[PDB]
Tab-separated table of C-alpha atoms and ligand atoms in Angstrom:
chain	number	residue	atom	x	y	z
L	1	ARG	CA	-7.625	99.085	53.625
L	2	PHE	CA	-10.788	97.568	55.314
L	3	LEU	CA	-10.377	94.047	54.189
L	4	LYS	CA	-13.119	91.338	54.223
L	5	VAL	CA	-13.081	87.717	55.505
L	6	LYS	CA	-15.630	85.303	54.312
L	7	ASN	CA	-17.092	82.165	55.962
L	8	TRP	CA	-18.004	79.603	53.261
L	9	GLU	CA	-20.165	77.061	55.140
L	10	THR	CA	-22.431	80.019	56.156
L	11	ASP	CA	-21.909	82.689	53.526
L	12	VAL	CA	-21.344	85.198	56.358
L	13	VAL	CA	-18.973	88.039	55.970
L	14	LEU	CA	-17.170	90.245	58.531
L	15	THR	CA	-15.034	93.396	58.032
L	16	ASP	CA	-11.503	93.553	59.434
L	17	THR	CA	-10.135	97.019	60.351
L	18	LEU	CA	-8.427	95.937	63.482
L	19	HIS	CA	-5.434	94.971	61.465
L	20	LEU	CA	-4.798	98.659	60.747
L	21	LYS	CA	-3.631	98.695	64.423
L	22	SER	CA	-1.103	95.941	63.675
L	23	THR	CA	2.656	96.746	63.940
L	24	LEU	CA	4.989	93.728	63.736
L	25	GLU	CA	5.869	91.947	60.368
L	26	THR	CA	4.516	88.453	59.462
L	27	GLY	CA	7.118	86.799	57.271
L	28	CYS	CA	5.075	87.289	54.341
L	29	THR	CA	5.836	89.557	51.667
L	30	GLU	CA	3.639	91.012	48.851
L	31	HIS	CA	4.982	88.153	46.760
L	32	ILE	CA	5.450	85.238	49.201
L	33	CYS	CA	3.222	83.703	51.953
L	34	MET	CA	4.878	82.259	54.885
L	35	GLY	CA	1.550	81.161	56.728
L	36	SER	CA	2.842	77.638	57.297
L	37	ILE	CA	6.370	78.314	58.670
L	38	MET	CA	6.235	77.569	62.299
L	39	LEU	CA	8.595	80.204	63.721
L	40	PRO	CA	9.685	83.100	61.374
L	41	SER	CA	12.092	85.672	62.528
L	42	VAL	CA	18.915	95.063	75.867
L	43	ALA	CA	16.129	97.409	74.470
L	44	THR	CA	16.852	101.121	74.461
L	45	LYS	CA	14.864	104.006	75.986
L	46	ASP	CA	14.432	105.684	72.482
L	47	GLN	CA	12.379	102.712	71.389
L	48	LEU	CA	10.822	101.981	74.767
L	49	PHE	CA	8.602	104.811	75.352
L	50	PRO	CA	6.788	104.549	71.817
L	51	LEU	CA	5.739	101.016	72.915
L	52	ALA	CA	4.907	102.517	76.477
L	53	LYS	CA	2.967	105.190	74.898
L	54	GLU	CA	0.995	102.857	72.596
L	55	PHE	CA	0.142	100.407	75.298
L	56	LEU	CA	-0.984	102.975	77.962
L	57	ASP	CA	-3.110	104.907	75.288
L	58	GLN	CA	-5.214	101.838	74.470
L	59	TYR	CA	-5.247	100.985	78.178
L	60	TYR	CA	-6.901	104.182	79.111
L	61	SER	CA	-8.942	104.040	75.749
L	62	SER	CA	-10.320	100.854	77.275
L	63	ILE	CA	-11.508	102.168	80.631
L	64	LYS	CA	-13.277	105.024	78.780
L	65	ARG	CA	-10.748	107.629	80.119
L	66	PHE	CA	-8.709	108.061	77.006
L	67	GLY	CA	-6.824	111.290	76.818
L	68	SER	CA	-7.889	112.466	80.398
L	69	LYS	CA	-5.157	113.868	82.625
L	70	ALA	CA	-5.349	110.650	84.677
L	71	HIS	CA	-4.004	109.313	81.306
L	72	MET	CA	-1.595	112.327	80.723
L	73	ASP	CA	-0.234	112.076	84.207
L	74	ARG	CA	0.309	108.356	83.876
L	75	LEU	CA	1.992	109.107	80.360
L	76	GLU	CA	4.201	111.800	81.966
L	77	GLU	CA	4.987	109.427	84.860
L	78	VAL	CA	6.054	106.593	82.612
L	79	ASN	CA	7.909	109.089	80.449
L	80	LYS	CA	9.983	110.408	83.349
L	81	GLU	CA	10.678	107.021	84.889
L	82	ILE	CA	11.866	105.982	81.430
L	83	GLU	CA	14.216	109.026	81.773
L	84	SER	CA	15.374	108.173	85.208
L	85	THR	CA	15.610	104.302	85.400
L	86	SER	CA	15.375	103.984	81.482
L	87	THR	CA	12.935	101.142	82.074
L	88	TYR	CA	9.651	101.266	83.865
L	89	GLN	CA	7.124	99.204	85.979
L	90	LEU	CA	3.506	98.422	85.146
L	91	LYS	CA	0.566	98.950	87.586
L	92	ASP	CA	-1.287	95.967	88.850
L	93	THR	CA	-4.212	96.925	86.542
L	94	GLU	CA	-1.925	97.511	83.569
L	95	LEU	CA	-0.292	93.893	84.208
L	96	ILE	CA	-3.687	92.224	84.265
L	97	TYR	CA	-5.034	94.158	81.173
L	98	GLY	CA	-1.767	93.428	79.269
L	99	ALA	CA	-1.691	89.854	80.160
L	100	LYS	CA	-5.265	89.241	79.131
L	101	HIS	CA	-4.664	91.000	75.768
L	102	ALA	CA	-1.450	88.890	74.930
L	103	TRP	CA	-3.740	86.038	75.165
L	104	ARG	CA	-6.587	87.837	73.242
L	105	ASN	CA	-4.083	88.676	70.418
L	106	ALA	CA	-2.651	85.093	70.223
L	107	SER	CA	-3.826	84.210	66.654
L	108	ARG	CA	-2.889	80.572	67.015
L	109	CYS	CA	-5.157	79.860	70.131
L	110	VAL	CA	-8.700	78.482	69.365
L	111	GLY	CA	-9.934	78.886	73.036
L	112	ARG	CA	-9.612	82.552	73.322
L	113	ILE	CA	-13.309	83.074	73.704
L	114	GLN	CA	-12.257	82.897	77.572
L	115	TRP	CA	-9.606	85.617	77.155
L	116	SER	CA	-11.288	87.953	79.705
L	117	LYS	CA	-11.636	85.275	82.393
L	118	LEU	CA	-7.999	84.951	83.276
L	119	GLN	CA	-6.335	85.053	86.745
L	120	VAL	CA	-3.216	87.052	86.838
L	121	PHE	CA	-0.549	86.165	89.653
L	122	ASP	CA	1.816	88.967	90.165
L	123	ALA	CA	5.100	87.210	90.941
L	124	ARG	CA	7.284	90.301	90.126
L	125	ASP	CA	8.402	90.630	93.790
L	126	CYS	CA	9.941	87.092	93.304
L	127	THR	CA	13.921	86.744	93.765
L	128	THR	CA	14.793	83.023	94.082
L	129	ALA	CA	14.249	79.749	92.293
L	130	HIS	CA	12.528	78.660	95.604
L	131	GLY	CA	10.272	81.645	95.357
L	132	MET	CA	9.509	80.669	91.586
L	133	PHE	CA	8.817	77.085	92.801
L	134	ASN	CA	6.225	78.405	95.340
L	135	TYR	CA	4.498	80.716	92.965
L	136	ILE	CA	4.364	77.965	90.331
L	137	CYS	CA	2.956	75.433	92.964
L	138	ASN	CA	0.242	77.868	93.956
L	139	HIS	CA	-0.437	78.405	90.157
L	140	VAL	CA	-0.960	74.504	89.507
L	141	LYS	CA	-3.091	74.160	92.574
L	142	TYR	CA	-5.308	77.072	91.692
L	143	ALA	CA	-5.463	76.536	87.991
L	144	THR	CA	-6.371	72.943	88.579
L	145	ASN	CA	-9.274	73.525	91.084
L	146	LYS	CA	-10.007	69.741	91.756
L	147	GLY	CA	-10.373	69.242	87.971
L	148	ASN	CA	-12.680	72.135	87.560
L	149	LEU	CA	-9.887	73.847	85.808
L	150	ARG	CA	-9.296	77.771	85.782
L	151	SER	CA	-6.969	79.527	83.413
L	152	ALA	CA	-4.162	81.426	84.945
L	153	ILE	CA	-0.693	83.036	84.333
L	154	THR	CA	2.219	83.744	86.704
L	155	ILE	CA	4.241	86.810	85.861
L	156	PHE	CA	7.840	86.781	87.113
L	157	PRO	CA	10.158	89.834	87.103
L	158	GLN	CA	10.781	91.406	83.650
L	159	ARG	CA	13.921	91.250	81.857
L	160	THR	CA	16.017	94.098	82.842
L	161	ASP	CA	19.756	94.184	81.405
L	162	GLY	CA	19.585	90.753	79.590
L	163	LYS	CA	21.711	88.742	81.834
L	164	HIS	CA	19.372	88.694	84.755
L	165	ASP	CA	16.281	86.891	83.534
L	166	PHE	CA	13.839	84.767	85.056
L	167	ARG	CA	13.198	81.420	83.138
L	168	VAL	CA	11.232	78.292	83.605
L	169	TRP	CA	13.319	75.973	81.658
L	170	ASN	CA	10.453	73.412	81.188
L	171	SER	CA	8.651	73.895	78.033
L	172	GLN	CA	5.356	73.077	80.022
L	173	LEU	CA	5.106	72.983	83.760
L	174	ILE	CA	3.821	69.396	83.529
L	175	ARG	CA	5.383	67.016	81.090
L	176	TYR	CA	6.284	63.233	81.172
L	177	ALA	CA	9.936	62.239	81.072
L	178	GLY	CA	11.768	61.060	77.953
L	179	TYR	CA	14.372	58.408	77.935
L	180	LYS	CA	16.076	56.762	75.009
L	181	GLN	CA	16.671	53.185	75.437
L	182	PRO	CA	19.831	51.083	75.087
L	183	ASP	CA	18.067	49.360	72.172
L	184	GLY	CA	17.760	52.644	70.213
L	185	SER	CA	14.083	53.052	70.966
L	186	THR	CA	12.594	55.540	73.302
L	187	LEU	CA	10.505	55.248	76.588
L	188	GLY	CA	8.213	58.055	77.782
L	189	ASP	CA	7.965	61.279	75.546
L	190	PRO	CA	10.545	61.384	72.889
L	191	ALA	CA	10.120	65.245	72.700
L	192	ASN	CA	11.474	65.680	76.055
L	193	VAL	CA	14.732	63.309	75.898
L	194	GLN	CA	17.005	66.343	75.440
L	195	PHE	CA	15.433	68.018	78.406
L	196	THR	CA	15.318	64.786	80.552
L	197	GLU	CA	19.003	64.477	79.904
L	198	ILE	CA	19.630	67.934	81.275
L	199	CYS	CA	17.484	67.086	84.231
L	200	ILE	CA	19.358	63.934	85.028
L	201	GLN	CA	22.564	65.992	84.215
L	202	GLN	CA	21.624	68.592	87.020
L	203	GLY	CA	21.122	65.666	89.252
L	204	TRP	CA	17.539	64.224	88.632
L	205	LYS	CA	16.870	60.728	89.978
L	206	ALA	CA	14.735	59.376	87.054
L	207	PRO	CA	12.252	56.654	87.977
L	208	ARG	CA	12.648	55.491	84.282
L	209	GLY	CA	9.054	54.777	83.492
L	210	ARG	CA	6.631	55.875	80.866
L	211	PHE	CA	4.529	58.721	82.513
L	212	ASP	CA	7.083	60.313	84.895
L	213	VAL	CA	6.430	63.893	85.767
L	214	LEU	CA	9.559	65.871	85.262
L	215	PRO	CA	10.906	68.224	87.893
L	216	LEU	CA	10.945	72.205	87.383
L	217	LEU	CA	14.178	73.795	86.256
L	218	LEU	CA	13.790	77.281	87.446
L	219	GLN	CA	16.221	80.009	86.703
L	220	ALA	CA	15.893	83.157	88.929
L	221	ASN	CA	17.757	86.471	88.095
L	222	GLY	CA	19.812	84.878	85.485
L	223	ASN	CA	21.154	82.449	87.912
L	224	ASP	CA	21.883	78.756	87.188
L	225	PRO	CA	18.629	76.936	87.490
L	226	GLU	CA	17.628	74.415	90.230
L	227	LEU	CA	15.521	71.253	90.339
L	228	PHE	CA	12.292	71.127	92.208
L	229	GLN	CA	9.702	68.424	92.056
L	230	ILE	CA	5.992	69.508	92.050
L	231	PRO	CA	4.323	67.735	94.780
L	232	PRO	CA	2.632	64.849	93.223
L	233	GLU	CA	-0.509	65.441	95.006
L	234	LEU	CA	-0.709	68.694	92.931
L	235	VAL	CA	-0.319	66.880	89.650
L	236	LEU	CA	-3.826	65.771	88.569
L	237	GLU	CA	-3.734	62.899	86.075
L	238	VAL	CA	-6.409	61.102	84.174
L	239	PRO	CA	-6.278	57.493	83.321
L	240	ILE	CA	-7.352	56.751	79.789
L	241	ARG	CA	-10.138	54.272	79.279
L	242	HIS	CA	-12.572	53.766	76.275
L	243	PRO	CA	-16.335	53.431	76.791
L	244	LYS	CA	-16.672	50.345	74.741
L	245	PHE	CA	-13.137	48.736	74.648
L	246	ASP	CA	-12.031	46.885	77.881
L	247	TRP	CA	-8.606	46.217	76.426
L	248	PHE	CA	-8.064	49.889	76.299
L	249	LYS	CA	-7.331	50.014	80.065
L	250	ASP	CA	-4.521	47.481	79.428
L	251	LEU	CA	-2.883	50.189	77.181
L	252	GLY	CA	-2.107	51.735	80.583
L	253	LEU	CA	-1.994	55.322	79.191
L	254	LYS	CA	-2.798	58.560	81.261
L	255	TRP	CA	-2.447	62.154	80.770
L	256	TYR	CA	-2.127	65.203	83.029
L	257	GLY	CA	-5.090	67.632	83.286
L	258	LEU	CA	-3.185	70.926	83.063
L	259	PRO	CA	-1.686	72.287	79.842
L	260	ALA	CA	0.602	75.060	81.107
L	261	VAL	CA	3.063	76.512	78.672
L	262	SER	CA	6.135	77.912	80.527
L	263	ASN	CA	8.716	78.743	77.700
L	264	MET	CA	7.128	81.802	75.973
L	265	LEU	CA	7.664	85.552	76.413
L	266	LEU	CA	5.025	88.106	77.576
L	267	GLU	CA	5.538	91.467	75.875
L	268	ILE	CA	3.604	94.387	77.598
L	269	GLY	CA	4.252	98.108	76.738
L	270	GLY	CA	7.713	97.174	75.543
L	271	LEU	CA	8.527	95.171	78.622
L	272	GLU	CA	9.543	91.632	78.209
L	273	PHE	CA	8.587	88.963	80.894
L	274	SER	CA	10.703	85.920	80.164
L	275	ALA	CA	9.004	83.685	82.646
L	276	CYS	CA	5.224	83.849	82.303
L	277	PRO	CA	3.696	80.296	82.729
L	278	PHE	CA	-0.012	80.286	81.361
L	279	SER	CA	-2.476	77.508	81.663
L	280	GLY	CA	-5.969	76.579	80.597
L	281	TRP	CA	-7.573	73.260	79.782
L	282	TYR	CA	-7.105	70.801	77.031
L	283	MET	CA	-8.754	70.573	73.802
L	284	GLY	CA	-9.190	66.718	73.358
L	285	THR	CA	-7.262	66.554	70.287
L	286	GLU	CA	-3.992	67.954	71.679
L	287	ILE	CA	-3.626	64.749	73.718
L	288	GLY	CA	-5.570	62.269	71.518
L	289	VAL	CA	-3.967	63.310	68.123
L	290	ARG	CA	-0.753	65.045	68.586
L	291	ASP	CA	0.684	63.704	72.014
L	292	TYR	CA	-0.748	60.204	71.428
L	293	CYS	CA	-0.267	59.726	67.608
L	294	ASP	CA	2.401	61.911	66.290
L	295	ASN	CA	5.246	59.752	64.933
L	296	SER	CA	7.982	61.472	67.032
L	297	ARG	CA	5.759	61.404	70.135
L	298	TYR	CA	4.031	58.389	71.819
L	299	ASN	CA	3.103	56.810	68.433
L	300	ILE	CA	0.387	54.479	69.776
L	301	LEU	CA	-1.815	54.081	66.550
L	302	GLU	CA	0.411	50.846	65.988
L	303	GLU	CA	-0.850	49.124	69.076
L	304	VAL	CA	-4.342	50.587	69.179
L	305	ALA	CA	-5.147	49.332	65.591
L	306	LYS	CA	-3.758	45.990	66.488
L	307	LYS	CA	-6.272	45.558	69.554
L	308	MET	CA	-8.971	46.692	67.231
L	309	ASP	CA	-7.948	43.976	64.786
L	310	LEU	CA	-7.679	46.345	61.812
L	311	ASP	CA	-6.767	45.939	58.061
L	312	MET	CA	-3.148	46.984	58.645
L	313	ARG	CA	-1.727	45.691	55.404
L	314	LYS	CA	-3.224	48.463	53.277
L	315	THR	CA	-2.486	52.101	53.755
L	316	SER	CA	-6.052	52.591	52.190
L	317	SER	CA	-8.071	50.788	54.792
L	318	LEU	CA	-7.907	54.079	56.781
L	319	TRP	CA	-6.876	51.927	59.795
L	320	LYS	CA	-4.812	54.798	60.894
L	321	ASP	CA	-7.742	57.158	60.701
L	322	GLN	CA	-10.029	54.625	62.406
L	323	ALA	CA	-7.750	54.003	65.476
L	324	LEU	CA	-7.284	57.730	65.605
L	325	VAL	CA	-11.035	58.404	66.271
L	326	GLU	CA	-11.358	55.768	69.083
L	327	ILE	CA	-8.319	57.268	70.793
L	328	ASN	CA	-9.959	60.642	71.019
L	329	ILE	CA	-13.153	59.234	72.016
L	330	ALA	CA	-11.101	57.700	74.927
L	331	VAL	CA	-9.317	60.927	75.938
L	332	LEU	CA	-12.608	62.866	75.952
L	333	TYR	CA	-14.644	60.092	77.824
L	334	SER	CA	-11.928	59.557	80.516
L	335	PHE	CA	-11.494	63.443	81.329
L	336	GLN	CA	-15.142	63.835	81.661
L	337	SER	CA	-15.873	60.765	83.720
L	338	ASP	CA	-13.362	62.118	86.168
L	339	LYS	CA	-14.835	65.627	86.003
L	340	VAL	CA	-11.588	67.157	84.665
L	341	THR	CA	-12.146	70.050	82.372
L	342	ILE	CA	-11.704	69.075	78.626
L	343	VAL	CA	-13.250	70.393	75.365
L	344	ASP	CA	-13.840	68.483	72.257
L	345	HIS	CA	-12.625	69.851	68.927
L	346	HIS	CA	-16.222	70.432	67.714
L	347	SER	CA	-17.294	72.577	70.656
L	348	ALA	CA	-13.998	74.466	70.662
L	349	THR	CA	-14.038	75.545	67.035
L	350	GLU	CA	-17.692	76.366	67.384
L	351	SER	CA	-16.866	78.844	70.194
L	352	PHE	CA	-14.011	80.312	68.345
L	353	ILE	CA	-16.209	81.222	65.352
L	354	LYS	CA	-18.617	82.560	68.115
L	355	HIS	CA	-15.645	84.473	69.559
L	356	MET	CA	-14.634	85.548	66.174
L	357	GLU	CA	-17.975	87.339	65.750
L	358	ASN	CA	-17.680	89.552	69.035
L	359	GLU	CA	-14.193	90.421	68.119
L	360	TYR	CA	-15.116	91.937	64.658
L	361	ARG	CA	-18.022	93.760	66.362
L	362	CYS	CA	-16.858	95.250	69.595
L	363	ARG	CA	-13.316	95.367	68.435
L	364	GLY	CA	-13.255	95.339	64.571
L	365	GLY	CA	-11.197	92.282	63.989
L	366	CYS	CA	-9.692	89.048	65.162
L	367	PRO	CA	-6.154	87.973	64.380
L	368	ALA	CA	-6.260	84.283	63.625
L	369	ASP	CA	-3.998	81.661	62.189
L	370	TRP	CA	-5.908	78.990	60.141
L	371	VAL	CA	-2.929	76.612	60.055
L	372	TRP	CA	-3.201	76.359	63.857
L	373	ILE	CA	-6.843	77.085	64.399
L	374	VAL	CA	-8.096	73.980	62.254
L	375	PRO	CA	-7.907	70.918	64.612
L	376	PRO	CA	-5.449	68.266	63.456
L	377	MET	CA	-8.108	65.845	62.756
L	378	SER	CA	-11.611	65.975	61.084
L	379	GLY	CA	-10.791	69.512	59.798
L	380	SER	CA	-13.615	70.177	57.444
L	381	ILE	CA	-16.407	68.879	59.780
L	382	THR	CA	-15.685	71.696	62.137
L	383	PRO	CA	-16.906	75.111	61.200
L	384	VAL	CA	-13.336	76.815	61.382
L	385	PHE	CA	-12.274	74.960	58.165
L	386	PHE	CA	-14.637	77.222	56.280
L	387	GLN	CA	-13.706	80.346	57.970
L	388	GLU	CA	-11.312	82.732	56.306
L	389	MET	CA	-8.886	84.155	58.994
L	390	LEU	CA	-6.663	87.163	58.758
L	391	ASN	CA	-3.351	86.729	60.647
L	392	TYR	CA	-1.526	89.732	61.850
L	393	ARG	CA	0.523	90.683	64.862
L	394	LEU	CA	-1.034	92.850	67.648
L	395	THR	CA	0.355	93.703	70.960
L	396	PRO	CA	0.497	92.889	73.866
L	397	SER	CA	1.527	89.350	72.740
L	398	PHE	CA	3.154	86.165	73.531
L	399	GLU	CA	6.306	85.334	71.739
L	400	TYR	CA	8.624	82.417	71.367
L	401	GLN	CA	11.913	82.709	73.083
L	402	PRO	CA	15.242	80.618	72.692
L	403	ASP	CA	15.807	77.693	74.981
L	404	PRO	CA	18.014	78.799	77.824
L	405	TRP	CA	20.508	75.945	77.709
L	406	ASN	CA	21.335	77.332	74.199
L	407	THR	CA	21.814	80.941	75.311
L	408	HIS	CA	22.692	81.057	78.926
L	409	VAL	CA	26.043	82.343	79.829
L	410	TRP	CA	26.332	79.440	82.427
C	1	LIG	C1	-9.441	78.081	77.861
C	1	LIG	C2	-8.649	77.005	77.744
C	1	LIG	C3	-7.633	77.052	76.549
C	1	LIG	C4	-7.866	76.215	75.397
C	1	LIG	C5	-9.019	75.199	75.048
C	1	LIG	C6	-6.685	76.676	74.406
C	1	LIG	C7	-6.514	75.959	73.269
C	1	LIG	C8	-5.396	75.911	72.651
C	1	LIG	C9	-4.790	75.112	71.483
C	1	LIG	C10	-5.644	73.886	71.148
C	1	LIG	C11	-3.623	75.509	71.258
C	1	LIG	C12	-2.678	74.715	70.160
C	1	LIG	C13	-1.558	74.246	70.945
C	1	LIG	C14	-0.649	73.297	69.952
C	1	LIG	O1	-1.150	73.000	68.979
C	1	LIG	O2	0.552	73.070	70.370
C	1	LIG	C15	-3.357	76.795	71.788
C	1	LIG	C16	-2.078	77.416	71.775
C	1	LIG	C17	-1.913	78.698	72.323
C	1	LIG	N1	-2.648	79.209	73.387
C	1	LIG	FE1	-4.535	78.780	73.818
C	1	LIG	N2	-5.977	77.566	75.190
C	1	LIG	C18	-6.424	77.983	76.292
C	1	LIG	C19	-5.930	78.834	77.263
C	1	LIG	C20	-4.851	79.715	76.965
C	1	LIG	C21	-4.416	80.682	77.837
C	1	LIG	C22	-4.751	80.664	79.350
C	1	LIG	C23	-3.218	81.427	77.200
C	1	LIG	C24	-2.372	82.545	77.591
C	1	LIG	C25	-2.442	83.269	78.864
C	1	LIG	C26	-3.271	80.997	75.913
C	1	LIG	C27	-2.455	81.146	74.873
C	1	LIG	C28	-2.158	80.408	73.907
C	1	LIG	C29	-0.970	80.814	72.910
C	1	LIG	C30	-0.099	81.944	73.040
C	1	LIG	C31	-0.854	79.593	72.182
C	1	LIG	C32	0.197	79.445	70.907
C	1	LIG	C33	1.526	79.159	71.574
C	1	LIG	C34	2.400	78.465	70.430
C	1	LIG	O3	2.461	79.029	69.357
C	1	LIG	O4	2.852	77.372	70.640
C	1	LIG	N3	-4.273	79.911	75.664
C	1	LIG	N4	-4.501	76.959	72.585
C	2	LIG	C1	3.802	74.573	70.725
C	2	LIG	N1	3.026	73.962	71.858
C	2	LIG	C2	2.325	75.075	72.667
C	2	LIG	C3	1.368	74.269	73.588
C	2	LIG	C4	1.633	73.154	73.851
C	2	LIG	C5	0.779	72.229	74.796
C	2	LIG	C6	-0.365	72.709	75.190
C	2	LIG	C7	-0.634	74.109	74.790
C	2	LIG	C8	-1.924	74.646	75.402
C	2	LIG	C9	-1.710	75.631	76.261
C	2	LIG	C10	-2.927	76.068	76.969
C	2	LIG	C11	-2.871	77.299	77.807
C	2	LIG	C12	-4.131	75.586	76.661
C	2	LIG	C13	-4.185	74.423	75.766
C	2	LIG	N2	-5.396	73.866	75.456
C	2	LIG	N3	-3.044	73.983	75.162
C	2	LIG	C14	0.230	74.951	73.978
C	3	LIG	C1	4.611	72.520	59.268
C	3	LIG	C2	3.334	73.072	59.899
C	3	LIG	O1	3.449	74.607	59.879
C	3	LIG	C3	3.144	72.511	61.232
C	3	LIG	O2	2.934	71.173	61.204
C	3	LIG	C4	2.116	73.183	62.149
C	3	LIG	C5	0.858	73.157	61.318
C	3	LIG	N1	-0.227	73.489	62.267
C	3	LIG	C6	-0.289	73.280	63.637
C	3	LIG	N2	-1.350	73.577	64.414
C	3	LIG	C7	-1.353	73.428	65.754
C	3	LIG	N3	-2.391	73.701	66.373
C	3	LIG	N4	-0.219	72.972	66.409
C	3	LIG	C8	0.877	72.591	65.632
C	3	LIG	O3	1.849	72.137	66.254
C	3	LIG	C9	0.940	72.747	64.356
C	3	LIG	N5	2.053	72.507	63.428
C	4	LIG	ZN1	0.805	84.710	54.088
């Protein structure tokens, strides 16, 4: 009941007991392993105080006042407000703790060494899609910090009944538009073409280029969402050059500095925050491997390998592999020559192993998803390839949620 994870590059072993505190199910049974399925699958007051009890107990058991009366009066206070209103509200300190631990428990995140250094923006007083748009601009500006990126989350009012829900309809706050062409093909980002249509549907005026920043579709208190365009001076973008190849400029590629996921749900003490955009900084491979070279994304390996003049008749020339390394040299180089925060997959996996140690020491475990932790290129020349990870679901936590245009009573 006190399981062991081994590292095979180092022969180092650690003991996981943190998984005893786990609660939610994983998809795996004693006779089936779902570790590579992407997404496996009102809340009453009878269930809401147990979750409120569990959260608050570890929150006072973090500030070395577990079991005190300051704890007990807080437990009694939440208990009775869960009688009165049936729901409850978190303290400022309980929200900052809960948010930082949702990140800390996010087993699919390799950059979690930074989990404590997070800036929480309490937007629970927000009421309008314009108020949402204000909070979100202030997040963008702060989290960007002139390229010296800082991580942050903005927490909008929690779900109450179920109809009245704050939702950022964008998947990330900043993404490039996606238009399918009359000739069947696709301009911009193909992942967003469904979204982009809903944007033009709500009256967006598309510039119809490659790297068009989408507007925000912000839904406030269950209301029909409204389009707002982040001021372009707030959207920091990096033009992508290669430090050897001058033809690389003519590829005319760029990316935005700020990775800010907006479509997930923040669970704290049984409360559900449907709108909780959180931002850090990019690991190089997300842009240079996935965004740029996924077949159903920008799919640029074709053209990069051309300009390198590569043996493209043969699958086995590793022409694909060769153009993939140059592209991530170009992402990295470009972001750093502009002083915009980016981390390479070597230094990020190293930090994660480093983070993983401290978690097994001063916490007794680190939930971790190998399928997601291993970078999508050069897997085994990074140290996380050789690290056995235990995946389990701790709380507070970030969760996926449905897209709102497929659930909203419109
Ligand atoms: C310090 C900078 C950060 C780095 C370098 C980093 C790194 C990464 C990477 C590479 C991924 C994989 C993304 C993908 O493959 O689609 C990821 C996912 C994730 N990150 Fe981190 N991240 C950072 C900050 C944050 C913050 C600030 C939060 C939350 C407050 C967070 C929570 C998550 C979660 C929940 C996921 C998984 C979401 C999903 O399953 O799609 N990360 N991160
Ligand atoms: C399923 N995609 C989730 C997703 C998509 C795109 C980017 C991220 C991300 C988020 C943060 C905070 C940091 C980082 N380096 N990347 C996450
Ligand atoms: C089918 C498979 O689970 C899927 O491709 C996963 C694999 N690992 C991943 N890992 C990361 N970091 N990001 C991803 O999108 C995925 N996709
Ligand atoms: Zn499994």
